[model samples]
Target chain A: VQIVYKPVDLSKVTSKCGSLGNIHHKPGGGQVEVKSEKLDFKDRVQSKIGSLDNITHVPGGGNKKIETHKLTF
Target chain B: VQIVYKPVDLSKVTSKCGSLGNIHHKPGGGQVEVKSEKLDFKDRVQSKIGSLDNITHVPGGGNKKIETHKLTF
Candidate 1:
């Protein structure tokens, strides 16, 4: 997904996370590229199958891990 | 900051960038911890000052990088 940040009074911008991490800025405004991943979704399903009485039967799984990345501007 | 995700119909959830990155799920709902950092703000100001004639003067800086982290549930 693309997150766009426009130029405004610096004082108007604030972050609760101490810092904003990495940003790519331009003359007027800047944008950031975000990528996400599901780390534990598939594995959870697989593990659940192994636990069931029917070894080969897999009903469903749960979501656990998700990784978000800042690709570029 | 903390982002909370509630459990609903699995099909109702969607992600634009591909995956959800790292997520910590609970029985009813889950939450993700977010951390952000500003990387290029100070350097931008320093570089802009350097471009000017007065080497010792530094006015203000621009924000360039913002890093967001998913800490935990």
Candidate 2:
């Protein structure tokens, strides 16, 4: 049995494909959570769909987790 | 531009999802090639769908390359 849970960091990002989650930093304190669906035995997946890092972050970021199939880190 | 080309090793493998490629080491010399499709912008992908390294490749293995949208390592 194979368990798949890939984490994605939607911090500062950009891409040609579609982006998964969203990130919005506030003036004060705020919270952002990125989630993904779980997969079965196997699926033909592409590259770093999430954490397509390279754009957003500078103002800082928030909590990131991938469970039940989402990615972390 | 978001380019997605993830390489997978279906050497020794197992999974709950579905496996992508195939592998058959022969008594004599042979060749093994793993290929993946290209991704533009972005796409929601799962874990390492290709290099599901865990089961086969006991007797030995062959070549691996992922270009245009594949993973190499």
Candidate 3:
């Protein structure tokens, strides 16, 4: 499964593609949680996508989690 | 941008959600290439997605490349 950390506003967030998993939201704390399952194929999936931002990847078959920080303006 | 390596048949592949990029197909080689643009957001997008498959990530702004092997079965 996949975990997505997004802003609380959810305005700038785009659509997600994957099987629905879990969602965690902190009231007024500006943290939103999104989880989905990645496709299971023998062939590999590769992508350039965008910048290699500061995202972490954990190994194994357990549920994935992502913690995001709010932006300061 | 993102690069996706798929099978030559394209029958088991699912739809992609991203800006249209490059599509390379090698006749009789059983290799297909798919590229798309990833969203650009200040907020982090995290996902557990799937297994940590044997995929490589290239750094910088240049186009990303992936070399996949055909299934032996």
Share of reference contacts found in each model: 0.01, 0.03, 0.00
Winner of 1 and 2 under TM-score: 2
Error of 3 at B42 (Å): 19
Q: Write the per-residue lDDT of candidate 2 for residues B1-73, one digit (tens) a residue.
A: 2334233423322112122233332222222333344332324554432221112221111222222321222
Better model by lDDT, 1 or 2? 2
- In Å, residue A20's CA in model 1 sits off its true spot by 43
Best by lDDT: 2
Over A11-37, each residue of candidate 1 has an lDDT whose tens digit, in order, gives 222112222222222122222232223
DockQ of each: 0.02, 0.03, 0.02
Whole-model alpha-carbon lDDT for candidate 2: 0.27
TM-score of each: 0.11, 0.14, 0.13
> Model 3: per-residue lDDT, tens digit, A4-24?
332232112123233322222
Best by DockQ: 2
Residue A55, candidate 2: how far off, in angstroms?
Answer: 35
**CAPRI accuracy category, model 1:** incorrect
User: Which stretches of candidate 3 lie above 4 Å from their native place?
Assistant: A1-60, B1-73
Poorest stretch of ten by lDDT in candidate 1 chain A: A50-59
